[PDB]
C-alpha cells in the first residue's frame, strides 16, 4: 500500500489550496482517509475523515467551515480543500489511509493510521 | 402464584447479585492479606460492611417465605440457609451486650501475657521444647490464671445471652443450634437427628477407647525416664507435660518416645535442596499428584495471581497457609513455602482445598460448601498420607531406588501418626462433652470446674498439675472456646479421614497394609471420590458418604486397621507395665 | 480531551532499555489508543494499536501496555534506528494526538 | 467487499439483551479471514457474554441467554464465532455496563428481542412499577473484571445467520 501526494505549493492570505491524494495497492471502498497537518517545530493536528463509500464525513470543529473533503472512486484519488487560508496555515499536510472508522457502519474501529503520505508542504 | 415458585424468583436474584458483593468483600481481604496498609484496611472494612448489610437485607425478605409451602429441597434447603435469625432475634440492648462481650473476651485472650512473655512465641515455646518440669508447670498454672480469671465473669454471661438467642430460633439450647449443621431431614432413609450426634459419637469413641489405653500406657512409661519423680505408673499423666500448653496434641513428645531410636526417619528435605527445588517446583510437582487421577489441573491464571513465595520485606504480608476463593473462577493460594517436607506436604492438603472448591463450583451460592464440617478437612487431609507414603517419594526421585523400608520404619512411622491423630480424639470429644452439658444446663455455674477436672481425668486420663477452683475458667483459655467456635468438627473429621482414604486405595487395588494404601494413578479412585466432591450441600452428608465409603454413618475401623501394625506391637510393649489409669491419683 | 507524554526528551545511549509514559485527562477505552513513531524528515508510522498489538512490520522489541488514564511504551533495548518522536493517540472521542516526545 | 471486519474488529460490542443485528448485503463476502468456532441476505448478530454461556448460543439448547435474551431456533443455518476480550471488555472497578435479562414473563421466539424494562412481578400484588417485595427488575448488570476465571471472563460473540 501507498499514498501519492502532490508538490509543494505557495498562497496568500484568503486563498484556497487544493491537495491530492492518489492511492493504491488496496480496495479503495474498504477504508477511509484522514488528513493530519504538521506545521513546523509541532506535533499532529487532526483534520478531518471522510468515507470512500458513504461519502460520510467527521470535521475536526477547529477546521469545520474551512475544510471540504471529497473523493473519485473511479481514479481511487482523494482530495481536501482548505479555504481562507491564515498566515498560521503554513504546514505540511498529510494523507492517510486510516483503520479507526468503518467506511460503510461509520463505527469506531480498533486501529490507527496505517499508511501514510509523504506530506505536502503548503506556504502562506 | 405459589411460595415455592416465588421462592425461585427470589433466590435466582439474591444469587446473581450476592456472588458480586460478596467477591469484592473476599478481594479486599486478599489485598490486605497479602500487603499490610492502613489504606487496604479501609478497603477492606468498606467492602466487608457492604456485604453484611445485603445479607441482613435478603434474610429479612426472605422471611415471608414459608418452608410448610415448599416441596422442593433443592429450593428448600437453598432458602432455610438464608431465613436464619441468628443474634438479631435479641433485643438491641442484649445484641450490644453480647458483641461486647464476644470482642472483649477474644482480645483478652489475643493479647493476654505473663509478665514479660506472650503466649505466641512465648510460653508455647516453652511448653513446645523445654524438657524442665518446673519450668513447664510455670508456664502452665500462670497463662490458666492471668488469662482465665479474666474470661469467667464474662464467659458466665456470654452462656446465658447465647441460650437466650438460640431458644429465640426454636432450639432447646445453644447445643443444638451449633451441631444443627448435622441435622438431615426430608429425605426417607437419611433422616439424622441433631439429638442423634451425641449418642453416635460417644459410641465410636468407646471403640477406639482400647487402642488409646495402649497409646497412653506406652506413651506413660517411656515419659517415666524423662519425669522418674513426677510420673506415676498406675496414675494419670499431669496435663503441663503433654508437649502443649493444652494438650490438645501429643506431638512435640516424638523426641521423648521413639520406638527405633537408631534408625532415621523419613526426610527428603536435603534430596530437595540437592536438587535445586524451589517453591514452583513444589506446587507442580503436587499438580502432578491430583492429575495423575483425573482431576483437572490448577486452573489458568492460578500461577499468576497466587502468592506461593515470600513476597520480600518492602512490604509486611501474611504468610499463614491457606486456600482462597473469591468466587467467579477466581481460585488462589496463599503460603510462603520453602525448600523442606513440611511444605512440600502441605501443597498437597492446600491444594486438596482447590480440588474440592473447583468440584462444587457449579452449585448455586449458598451451597458453595463441603456436605458438612469434615468434608473439606478429610477431602485435603488424605492427600498428606499419600504424598508422605515412601513409594510415591522413591517414585518422585526424593528417595534412593534401592530405599529398602523395614519393620523398625514402619513403627516410627505409624507412632508419629498415632501420636497427632488418635492421641487427640479423647480430648475433642471431652472438651465438647462439657460445653454441651453447660450450655443445655445440666451443670450449675459452680459446679462446672470440677466436672471439667473430673471428666477429663476419666475420658483422657490428664490430671490437674495444681487445684483450680471456680475464680478460673481454663476451658476460656483456649482459642476455639473464647473466640466462639464449635470444636466437634476435628472429631467428626479423622473418623472420614480413614473411611474415605481406605475406600478409595482399595478402588486402586491395592494389596497390603492400609498405611502402605497409597492413591495414585489409578482412576478408578479417583472419580470415585469426585462423585461426592461436586455435590456440596445439594445432599445429605449421608449420601455423599454412602457414594463412596458405602457407610451412612461415622464406622471407625478404617481407624482402627490403619494403626493395626501398631496396636499389635503396643500390646507385646505393655506385657509388663499397667494398662489404664487411677483416677484417685493426684501430683 | 487532552493527552499528556513525558519526558518530553528522553535521551538515552543506545543499548539501554527506555520508556515513555502518556496520561489522558479523562478516562479512554484501550481500544482506541495507539502509538506513532516519527523519524526526522519522514511521514509518521503506526507503531502499535489497540493499546498492545504491534503493528504488522514492527519489532518485538516494542511493546504497549496500559489502562484507564495511564499508558506506556516500552523499548526492550534503544537501537540508533530509534531515536525518533513518538506520540500518543486516542479516538476515544474525536480525535487528538499528545504533544510528543524526543529519544 | 464487504465489511466483515467493521464487525469482528470495532471498539464496541452490545448487550445481550439488546444485540446488534447488522445486514449484509450487495457485496462480494469473502470470508477467507478462538475460543469456539461451530457451523440470500447474511445477518451478523454481535454482543457480549460470559464465557460458560457460549454454550447456550447453538439449536437445542436452553438457558438465561437461550431463554431470556438470544434466543437461536433449532433449524438454524450459520456459524457461532467467540473469542476471549478479556483485555478490552474488563475493569479492575467492574466493567458494569454489559447488562441481560435474568427474568421475564414468557420465553423468547426465534430472533425475538425486547428491550423493555417494566418492572417483574413476582408475587400476586401489584407494586405499582416499585421493586419492592416480590417485585424485580428485569435487567442485571455483569461485574466484568480481569482477574476472574475462564467461565467466568467476557467473551465476543458474533453469530452469522445464513
Ligand atoms: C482484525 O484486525 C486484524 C489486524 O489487522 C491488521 O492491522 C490493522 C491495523 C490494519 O493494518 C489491517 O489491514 C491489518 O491486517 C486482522 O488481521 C483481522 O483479519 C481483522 N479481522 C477481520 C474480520 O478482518
Ligand atoms: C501495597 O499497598 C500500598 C499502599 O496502598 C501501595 O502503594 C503498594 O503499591 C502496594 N503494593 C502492591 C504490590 O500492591
Ligand atoms: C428442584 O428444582 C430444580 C431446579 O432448581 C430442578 O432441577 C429439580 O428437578 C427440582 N426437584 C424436583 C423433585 O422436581
Ligand atoms: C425470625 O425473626 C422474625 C422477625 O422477628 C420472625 O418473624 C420469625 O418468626 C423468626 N424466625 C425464626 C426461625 O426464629
Ligand atoms: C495438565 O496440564 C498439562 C500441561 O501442563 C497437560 O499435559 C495435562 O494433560 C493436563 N491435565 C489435565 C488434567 O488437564
Ligand atoms: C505413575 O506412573 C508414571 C508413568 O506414567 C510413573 O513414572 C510413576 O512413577 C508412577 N507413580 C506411582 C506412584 O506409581
Redesign the interface.
Known amino acids: 500500500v501507498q499514498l501519492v501526494q502532490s508538490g509543494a505549493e505557495v498562497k496568500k492570505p484568503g486563498a484556497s489550496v487544493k491537495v491530492s491524494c492518489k492511492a493504491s495497492g488496496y480496495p479503495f471502498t474498504s477504508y477511509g482517509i484522514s488528513w493530519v497537518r504538521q506545521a513546523p517545530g509541532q ?4 483534520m478531518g ?1 471522510i468515507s470512500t463509500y458513504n461519502g460520510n464525513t467527521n470535521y ?1 470543529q477547529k477546521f469545520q467551515g474551512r475544510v471540504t473533503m471529497t473523493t473519485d472512486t473511479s481514479t481511487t484519488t482523494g482530495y481536501m480543500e482548505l479555504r481562507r487560508l491564515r498566515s498560521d496555515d503554513t504546514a505540511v499536510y ?1 494523507c492517510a489511509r486510516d ?3 468503518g467506511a460503510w457502519f461509520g463505527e ?1 474501529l ?5 499508511n ?4 505536502t508542504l503548503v506556504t502562506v | 402464584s405459589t411460595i415455592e415458585e416465588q421462592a425461585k424468583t427470589f433466590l435466582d436474584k439474591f444469587n446473581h447479585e450476592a456472588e458480586d458483593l460478596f467477591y469484592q468483600s473476599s478481594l479486599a481481604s486478599w489485598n490486605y492479606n497479602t500487603n499490610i496498609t492502613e489504606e487496604n484496611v479501609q478497603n477492606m472494612n468498606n467492602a466487608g460492611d457492604k456485604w453484611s448489610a445485603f445479607l441482613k437485607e435478603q434474610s429479612t425478605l426472605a422471611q415471608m417465605y414459608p418452608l410448610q409451602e415448599i416441596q422442593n429441597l433443592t429450593v428448600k434447603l437453598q432458602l432455610q440457609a438464608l431465613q436464619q435469625n441468628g443474634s438479631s432475634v435479641l433485643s438491641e440492648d442484649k445484641s450490644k451486650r453480647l458483641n461486647t462481650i464476644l470482642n472483649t473476651m477474644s482480645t483478652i485472650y489475643s493479647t493476654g501475657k505473663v509478665c514479660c512473655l506472650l503466649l505466641e512465641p512465648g510460653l508455647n515455646e516453652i511448653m513446645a521444647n523445654s524438657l524442665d518440669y518446673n519450668e513447664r508447670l510455670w508456664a502452665w498454672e500462670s497463662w490458666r490464671s492471668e488469662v482465665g480469671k479474666q474470661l469467667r465473669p464474662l464467659y458466665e454471661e456470654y452462656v446465658v445471652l447465647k441460650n437466650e438467642m438460640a431458644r429465640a430460633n426454636h432450639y432447646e439450647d445453644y447445643g443444638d443450634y451449633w451441631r444443627g449443621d448435622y441435622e438431615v431431614n426430608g429425605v426417607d432413609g437419611y433422616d439424622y437427628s441433631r439429638g442423634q450426634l451425641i449418642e453416635d459419637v460417644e459410641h465410636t469413641f468407646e471403640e477406639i477407647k482400647p487402642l488409646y489405653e495402649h497409646l497412653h500406657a506406652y506413651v506413660r512409661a517411656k515419659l517415666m525416664n524423662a519425669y522418674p519423680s513426677y510420673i506415676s505408673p498406675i496414675g494419670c499423666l499431669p496435663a503441663h507435660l503433654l508437649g502443649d500448653m493444652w494438650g490438645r496434641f501429643w506431638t512435640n513428645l516424638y523426641s521423648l518416645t521413639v520406638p527405633f531410636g537408631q534408625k532415621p526417619n523419613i526426610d527428603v528435605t536435603d534430596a530437595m535442596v540437592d536438587q535445586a527445588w524451589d517453591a514452583q517446583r513444589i506446587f507442580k510437582e503436587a499438580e502432578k499428584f491430583f492429575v495423575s487421577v483425573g482431576l483437572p489441573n490448577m486452573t489458568q491464571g492460578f500461577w499468576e495471581n497466587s502468592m506461593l513465595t515470600d513476597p520480600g520485606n518492602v512490604q509486611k504480608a501474611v504468610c499463614h497457609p491457606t486456600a482462597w476463593d473469591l468466587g467467579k473462577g477466581d481460585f488462589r493460594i496463599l503460603m510462603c513455602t520453602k525448600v523442606t517436607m513440611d511444605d512440600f506436604l502441605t501443597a498437597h492438603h492446600e491444594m486438596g482445598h482447590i480440588q474440592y472448591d473447583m468440584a462444587y463450583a457449579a452449585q448455586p451460592f449458598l451451597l458453595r460448601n463441603g456436605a458438612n464440617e469434615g468434608f473439606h478437612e478429610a477431602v485435603g487431609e488424605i492427600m498428606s498420607l499419600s504424598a508422605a507414603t515412601p513409594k510415591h517419594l522413591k517414585s518422585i526421585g526424593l528417595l534412593s531406588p534401592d530405599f529398602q523400608e523395614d519393620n523398625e520404619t514402619e513403627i516410627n512411622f505409624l507412632l508419629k501418626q498415632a501420636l497427632t491423630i488418635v492421641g487427640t480424639l479423647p480430648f475433642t470429644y471431652m472438651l465438647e462433652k462439657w460445653r454441651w452439658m453447660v450450655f443445655k444446663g445440666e451443670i450449675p455455674k459452680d459446679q462446672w470446674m470440677k466436672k471439667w477436672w473430673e471428666m477429663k481425668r476419666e475420658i483422657v486420663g490428664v490430671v490437674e498439675p495444681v487445684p483450680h477452683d471456680e475464680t478460673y475458667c481454663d476451658p476460656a483459655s483456649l482459642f476455639h472456646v473464647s473466640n466462639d467456635y464449635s470444636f466437634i468438627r476435628y472429631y467428626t473429621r479423622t473418623l472420614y479421614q480413614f473411611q474415605f482414604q481406605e475406600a478409595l486405595c482399595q478402588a486402586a487395588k491395592h494389596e497390603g497394609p492400609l498405611h502402605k494404601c497409597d492413591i495414585s494413578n489409578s482412576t478408578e479412585a479417583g472419580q470415585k471420590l469426585f462423585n461426592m466432591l461436586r455435590l456440596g450441600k445439594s445432599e445429605p452428608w449421608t449420601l455423599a458418604l454412602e457414594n463412596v465409603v458405602g457407610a451412612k454413618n461415622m464406622n471407625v475401623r478404617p481407624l482402627l486397621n490403619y494403626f493395626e501394625p501398631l496396636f499389635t506391637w503396643l500390646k507385646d510393649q505393655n506385657k509388663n507395665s499397667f494398662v489404664g489409669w487411677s483416677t484417685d491419683w493426684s501430683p | 480531551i487532552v493527552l499528556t507524554q513525558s519526558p518530553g526528551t528522553l535521551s538515552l545511549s543506545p543499548g539501554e532499555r527506555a520508556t515513555l509514559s502518556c496520561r489522558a485527562s479523562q478516562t479512554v ?4 489508543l ?1 502509538w ?1 513513531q516519527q523519524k526526522p524528515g519522514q ?4 507503531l502499535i ?2 493499546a ?1 498489538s504491534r ?1 504488522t512490520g514492527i519489532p518485538d522489541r516494542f511493546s504497549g501496555s496500559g ?2 488514564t495511564d499508558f506506556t511504551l516500552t523499548i526492550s533495548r534503544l537501537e540508533p534506528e530509534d531515536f525518533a518522536v513518538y ?1 500518543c ?1 486516542q ?1 476515544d472521542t ?7 516526545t524526543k529519544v | 467487499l464487504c465489511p466483515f471486519h467493521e464487525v469482528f474488529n470495532a ?2 460490542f452490545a448487550s445481550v439483551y439488546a444485540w446488534n443485528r447488522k445486514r449484509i448485503s450487495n457485496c462480494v463476502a469473502d470470508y477467507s479471514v478462538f475460543f469456539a468456532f461451530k457451523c440470500t441476505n447474511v445477518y451478523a448478530d454481535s454482543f457480549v457474554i460470559r464465557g460458560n454461556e457460549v454454550s447456550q448460543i447453538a439449536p437445542g439448547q436452553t438457558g438465561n441467554i437461550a431463554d431470556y435474551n438470544y434466543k437461536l431456533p433449532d433449524d438454524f443455518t450459520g456459524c457461532v464465532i467467540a473469542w476471549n476480550s478479556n ?2 471488555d474488563s ?2 472497578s467492574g466493567n458494569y455496563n454489559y447488562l441481560y435479562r435474568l427474568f421475564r414473563k414468557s420465553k423468547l421466539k426465534p430472533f425475538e428481542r425486547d428491550i423493555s424494562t417494566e418492572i417483574y412481578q413476582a408475587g400476586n400484588k401489584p407494586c405499582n412499577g416499585v421493586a419492592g417485595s416480590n417485585c424485580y427488575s428485569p435487567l442485571q448488570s455483569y461485574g466484568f473484571r480481569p482477574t476472574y476465571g475462564v467461565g467466568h471472563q467476557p467473551y465476543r460473540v458474533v453469530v452469522l445467520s445464513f
Do not use: N
Not at chain 3, 477505552?29 to 482506541?32: D, F, G, H, M, P
Open positions: 506535533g499532529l493536528e487532526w475523515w475536526a498529510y483503520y479507526t472508522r469506531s480498533i486501529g490507527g493510521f496505517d501514510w503520505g509523504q506530506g | 477505552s484501550s481500544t482506541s495507539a506513532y511521514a509518521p508510522r503506526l494499536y489497540g498492545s503493528a489502562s484507564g506520540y493517540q479516538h474525536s480525535l487528538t494526538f499528545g504533544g510528543g | 471498539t464496541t483485555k478490552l475493569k479492575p
